[PDB]
Amino acid sequence: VFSAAMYSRFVKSALDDLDKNDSTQIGIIANQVALPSKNPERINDKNLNILLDILSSNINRIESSRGTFLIQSIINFEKWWELPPHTLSKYIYFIKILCSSIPKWWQDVSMILVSCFILPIKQTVCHHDMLKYFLRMIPSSMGFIDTYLAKFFPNKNDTRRKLVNYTSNLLKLRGYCSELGFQIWSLLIEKIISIDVELQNELDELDTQGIKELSTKLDSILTLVSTHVEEQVTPESLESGEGVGVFNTLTTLFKTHVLPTYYTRSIQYIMFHVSQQQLELMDSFLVTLIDISFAVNEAAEKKIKSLQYLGSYIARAKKLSRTQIIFVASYLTSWLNRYVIEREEEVDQRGGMERFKHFYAAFQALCYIFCFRHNIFRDTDGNWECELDKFFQRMVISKFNPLKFCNENVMLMFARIAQQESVAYCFSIIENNNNERLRSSWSLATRQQFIDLQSYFPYDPLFLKNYKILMKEYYIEWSEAS
Amino acid sequence: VFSAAMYSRFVKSALDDLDKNDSTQIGIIANQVALPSKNPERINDKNLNILLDILSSNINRIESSRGTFLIQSIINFEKWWELPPHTLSKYIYFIKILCSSIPKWWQDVSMILVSCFILPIKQTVCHHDMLKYFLRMIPSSMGFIDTYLAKFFPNKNDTRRKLVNYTSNLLKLRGYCSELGFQIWSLLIEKIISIDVELQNELDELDTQGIKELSTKLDSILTLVSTHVEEQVTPESLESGEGVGVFNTLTTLFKTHVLPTYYTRSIQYIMFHVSQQQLELMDSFLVTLIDISFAVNEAAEKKIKSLQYLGSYIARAKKLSRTQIIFVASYLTSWLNRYVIEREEEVDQRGGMERFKHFYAAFQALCYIFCFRHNIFRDTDGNWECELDKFFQRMVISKFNPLKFCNENVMLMFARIAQQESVAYCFSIIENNNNERLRGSSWSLATRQQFIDLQSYFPYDPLFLKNYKILMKEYYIEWSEAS
Incomplete structure (x- = not known):
């Protein structure tokens, strides 16, 4: 019933009354704007355009405590991104004006924006435009925005679409806000481990529907993470752009989160995937795994976990060179x-075989590698690299008797292959060990922890469907190796 | 003047006299025995045989405080090993009887024996026989015998024959006394470093050519030490034997003495030589060098010294396999x-290029290896192992600019070879670096020199010690062979 001029005067007078401390007329307007999207009596675009243009023209007129309700009403306008082009434009311009003159409101606007991260990339274009603008104008905002990133992350239990969209947006945000890059990656990693760990405990609790839900969730998130990482970690980006940063944050988060957790079935594949993008990245990963595997101050647990990571890696990583292997x-x-030369003398001395945990861990890692790579170790002349046809036998006959203490199935498979390749002869030592067992010593309590650590292979097949397809190019299944 | 029976009664009566506190007759005898080898009036073998057989027959008769002088007189008999067969036999039997009934005298006997280590192996057979016997019967003796080993070691300044014989005997003693093995090796190493260090300081002082003395000394000792080690460290000896213990003590002594006492010209060749005896020994040496080179808690100095040991080793050790290299x-x-990926960002940040000491050290070690081994890195297909034709260039152009901070001559030789092999192009970066230097990244000139000195020192640069050089040829790559 209101004409363009009729509504324009209506608002112009409401502000004249606001100046003289009325607030009656302005609150009438602020109530009409606050109303839900579904309600037809809510302010229409025509009148909303007028309101916004008049408010934008002189924002100071509403800066008072009497104008606080009107401002909150506009900030809390339901589905504002769902506004028509010209109306949406006036809303954006209003907010841009508001948070420039009164930066206090950016704390409220940004909160709503971050809560919109559960919407698709196509639907969030203006949310990121606004975040990008004000994160530059008000850099101090990065603190509370980081807290919103955590607050608004969807529950494991929430929809896969919400979880997948929140990750897409977090990665988009990462692209214009490098300063927030590590927190975004940490948040993602922390959330992906949560999914993985829960999926495994849920598979272990069996001995159901939550398993199918978590599977498709973890699959859609990882596939997206590694796809984005394939894009970001390029030889051209390594040579110039933040190719280097992505690889570095993920390596740090692998050392701090993945490895120490250990018993996970999918998270570690971010590292498997990124590694194989370029020769140098597989070099850094290998050396990192070697360092953790043999470092002097690291706990025995960490060294055994790294040695299992090392062996599974060399065995499975398709893009590895003969020379790297x-x-x-x-x-x-x-x-x-060296361990045999320096330490064999300690075996017949006081103490048990637990003293040599690290020896069995390192020997298993090599045996495993040989199971998957024996074909590579035969040089042009038909001779064995690293004198494996003399080495293995020396180990297997040693006082340590690694066949007895390493993973039973790895030792059995090794014995099978090593006998075939005329490399080593284990089966008599295995016979002897089984017979002694039926009729050296290690404390049964701590013994199981070790058996458990050696049973876990981090790069054993991925069951997640899409992520599996993405890996084929970077993966060696036992069928290919054997 | 005395007949066999006349002397026999003369000693029998002296002991009867001794029982009634009369040491005059016994002391007359004890003075006759004490007399120098050179003196003709000293008791002759005939009469000495009688004395010893009567004393051996009942040692308890002389156990008293009144018989102490006679016993000391026999223990201190000059050149007793120079005695004729039967006379020497009676002397040995006497001593054997003495130290079995009265173990207190073994402390005196062993001292003389250890002082005889300056004599040749041919001349010490009975000294070692005696040591071997009593080290078993009186194991407690090992303590003071170890102290004698140190006390009696000849001076650097003493005869090369005394120094060479003392080492031969110490190695013989090592063969029957494993419990003393480490101390023997530590004593030898400590003494060989003393010779090497003095020879270098003496070469440093001129810019006394009496140095020829130290050269022939160090040469004769090392040649022997490594020859004996070639014998002891055998494949049979390693699978089940004391060959493992020899390699282990020398590796320990390399870590504790050789490596920290840097700037030595020959000592480290014990390690160079033993390494190359078998595949496994080179494996252990390599991994040991890698550990010290990159360990997290080690001092930067130790890491740079090990990196120079690593590079010189790979380049020089002839018995190495392509795969080991x-x-x-x-x-x-x-x-x-990894260092460039993780750390290049720190270069334009606060702090100087000294922060990257370890990067320069590791890059030099590789450059050096390539100088001597480039030919090996070209695979069957003509391609470069470790993508060296892409790798080097990446480093050379990096923010670290290693060409500016590594050893000038290694960088120059590398640049020469790398340009020839179409591997890397350094000469423009070198031109740029010389030009920037002429106008005047930064590094404090005090700490800078220590680094320049450490990178200039190559432990496996040629041996000048004449015999030891000949022994090494088989295990050594001279620049002439490599180039």
Whole structure:
């Protein structure tokens, strides 16, 4: 019933009354704007355009405590991004004006924006435009925005679409806000581990529907993370752009979150995938795994967990060079050759076989590598690299008797392959060990922890469907190796 | 003047006299026995045989405080090993009887024996026989015998024959007394470093050519020490034997003495030599060098010294396998690839280029290896192992600018070879670096020199000690062979 001029005067007078401390007329307007999207009596676009243009023209007129309700009413306008082009434009301009003159409101506006991260990338274009603008104008805002990133992250139990959209947006935000890059990655990693751990405990609790839900969730999130990472970690980006930063944050988060947790079935594949993007990235990963595996001050647990990561990695990573593989075999054989020379004398001395936990861990890692790579170790002349046809036998006959203390199935498979390749002869030592067992010593309590650590192979097949397809190119299944 | 029976009664009566506190007759005898080897009036073998057989027959008769002088007189008999067969036999039997009934005298007998270590192996057979016997019967003796080993070691300044014989005997003693093995090796190492260090300081002082003395000394000792080690460290000896213990003590002594006492010209060749005896021993040495080179808590100095040991080793050790060499190149390239990825961002940040000491050290070690081994890195297909034709260039152009901070001559030789092999192009970066230097990244000139000195020192640069050089040829790559 209100004409363009009729509504324009109506608002102009409401502000004249606001100046003289009325607030009656303004509150009438603020109530009409606050009303839900579904309600037809809510302010229409025509009149909303007028209101916004008049308010934008002189924002100071509403800066008072008497104008606080009107401002909150506009900030809390339901589905404002769902507004028609010209109306949406006036709303954006209003907010832009508001948070420039009164930066206090940016704390409220940003909160709503971050809560919109559960919407698709196509639907959030203006939310990111606003975040980008004000994160630059008000850099101090990064603190509370980081807290919103955590507050608004969807529950594991929430929809896969909400979880997948929140990750898409967090990665988009990451692209214009480098300063928030590590917190975004930490938040993602922390949430992906939560999903993975719960999916495994739920599979362990069996011995159901929550398993199918968590599976498709974890699959859609990881596939997206590794796809985005494939884009960001490029030889051109390594040579110039933040190719280097992505690889570095994920390596840090692997050391701090993935490895220490250990018993996970999918998270570690972010590292498996990124590694294989370029030769140098597989070099850094290998050396990192070697360091953690053999560092002097690290706990025995960490060293055994890293050694299982090392062996599973060399075995499975398709993009690894013959020379990179032989590098790990050369390190392992050299390290083990030294352990026998320096330490075999300690075996018949006081103490049990638990003293040599680290020896069995390193020997298993090499045995596993040989199971998957034996074909590579045969040089042009038909001779064995690292003298494996003399090395293994030396180990297997040693006082440590690694066949007795390493993972039963790895030792059995190794014995099978090593006998075939005329490399080593284990079956008599295995016969002897089984017979002794039926009729050296290690404390049964701590013994199980070790058996458990050696049973876990981090790069054993991915069951998540899409992520599996993405990995084929970077993965060696037992069918290919054997 | 005395007949066999006349002397026999003369001693029998002296002991009867001794029972009634009369040491005059016994002391007359004890003075006759004490007399120097050179003196003709000293008791002759005929009469000495009688004395010893009568004393051996009932040692308890002389156990008293009144018989102490006679016993000391026999223990201190000059050149007793120079005695004729039957006379020497009676002397040995006497001593054997003496130290079995009265173990107190073994402390005196052993002292003389250890002082005889300056005599040749041919001349000490009975000294070792006696040591071996009583070290078993009186195991407690090992303590003071160890102290004698140190006390009696000849001076650097003493005859090369005395120094060479003392080492031969210490190694013989080592063969029957494993419990003393480590101390023997520590004593030898400590003494060989003393000679090496003095020879270098003496070469340093001129810019006394009496140095020729130290040269022939150090040469004769090392040649012997490594020859004996070649014998002891055998594949049979390693699988089940004391060959493991020899390699282990020398590796320990390398870590504790050789490596920290840097700037030595020959000592480290014990390690160079033993390493190359078998595949496994080189494996252990390599991994040990890698550990010290990159360990987190070690001092920067130790890491730079080990990195220079690593590079010189790979380049020089002839018995190394292609795969062992590529192993070190693979470790170095992988470690350096990571250092640029993780750390290049720190270069334009606060602090100087000294922060990256360790990067320069590791990059030099690889450059050096490539100078001597480039030919090996070209695979069957003609491609470069470890992508060296892409790797080097990446480092050389990095913010670290290693060409500016590593050893000038190694960088120059590397640049020469790398340009020839179409591997890397350094000469423009070198031109740029010389030009920037002429106008005047930054590094405090005080700490800078220590680094320049550490990078200039290559432990496996040629041996000048004449015999030891000949022994090494088989295990050594001179620049002439490499280039």
